């Protein structure tokens, strides 16, 4: 596992030689050299161990919250390429001298976007639970997906690698759980038709048996009655089926293209 070749107690040696030259004692010169390179390498190596320590902390939070492994990915490959290119460095190199600062900047930006990831992730996931709990209505789930939509939009300002397919994995899970809720609503329509599922309103169909010029008939027709019952079915389909399918990206401003109603 990740650790660095450094010892803090070496700053204790630096403290002791910065005291005892002042107390008049002539010290050996290789100790002065070792405390001098300790003086050069002291903020840089502790900047390395906070980068490594916060790296293993954010490693733990992405293996725990692995659900969003797809929203770290370009930053993850930047920090993995930075540690893979920081394989080749040594303590004699003056190439570490911007490098640890670029590493700590990417540690901080990684921390920034993994905590923004946490906030907007958990607000999206509890809004997925708000799809799972509230009432069987087109408008209610529409502002649910609008807030999830603009949450995805503000996460798309950050522009990671494989951001949009994570959104499509969410939308197919929405589509499956909406199939479960549509099964609840249609079974509620089935039971309310015979005298979490919502409230189906299955209206009375008015028929008058009718004589016009010695001909007993029925007006309105029974095919129209069966037709009207299928209108109340297709309107009870319309609650879940015309809930708008979120795209993988909705920053496609220059795209007026490939828009069918099963994608809409």
């Amino acid at each position: 596992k990740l650790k660095v070749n450094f010892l803090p107690e070496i700053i204790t040696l630096s403290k002791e030689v910065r005291n005892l030259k002042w107390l008049g004692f002539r010290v050996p010169l290789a100790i002065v050299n070792k405390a001098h390179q300790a003086n050069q390498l002291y903020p840089f190596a502790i900047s390395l161990i906070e980068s490594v320590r916060t790296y293993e902390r954010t490693c733990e939070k992405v293996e725990e919250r692995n659900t969003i492994s797809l929203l770290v990915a370009g930053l993850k490959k930047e920090v993995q390429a930075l540690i893979a290119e920081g394989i080749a460095l040594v303590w004699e190199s003056y190439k570490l001298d911007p490098y640890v600062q670029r590493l700590a900047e990417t540690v901080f930006n990684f921390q920034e976007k993994v905590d923004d990831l946490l906030i907007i992730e958990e607000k999206i996931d509890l809004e997925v639970r708000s799809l799972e709990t509230c009432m069987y209505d087109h408008k209610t789930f529409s502002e649910i997906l609008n807030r999830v939509q603009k949450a995805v939009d503000d996460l798309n300002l950050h522009s990671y690698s494989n951001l949009p397919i994570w959104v499509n994995k969410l939308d197919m899970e929405i589509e499956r759980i909406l199939g479960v809720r549509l099964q609840a609503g249609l079974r509620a329509w089935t039971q309310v038709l015979l005298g979490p599922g919502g409230e189906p309103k299955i209206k009375n169909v008015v028929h008058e048996l009718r004589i016009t010029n010695q001909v007993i008939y029925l007006n309105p027709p029974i095919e129209e009655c069966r037709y009207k019952l299928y209108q109340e079915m297709f309107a009870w389909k319309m609650v879940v089926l015309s809930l708008p399918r979120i795209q993988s990206q909705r920053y496609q401003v220059g795209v007026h293209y490939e828009l069918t109603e099963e994608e809409k």
Partner: peptide, 28 residues
């Protein structure tokens, strides 16, 4: 012309990247 979808561009995780770099230093 459909939106012909790209391959699974992905980040390998720190466990498998650390086993990869452990193999890279085991070669070194």
């Amino acid at each position: 012309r459909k939106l012909v979808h790209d391959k699974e561009l992905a980040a390998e995780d720190e466990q498998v990247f650390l086993m990869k770099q452990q193999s890279l230093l085991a070669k070194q």
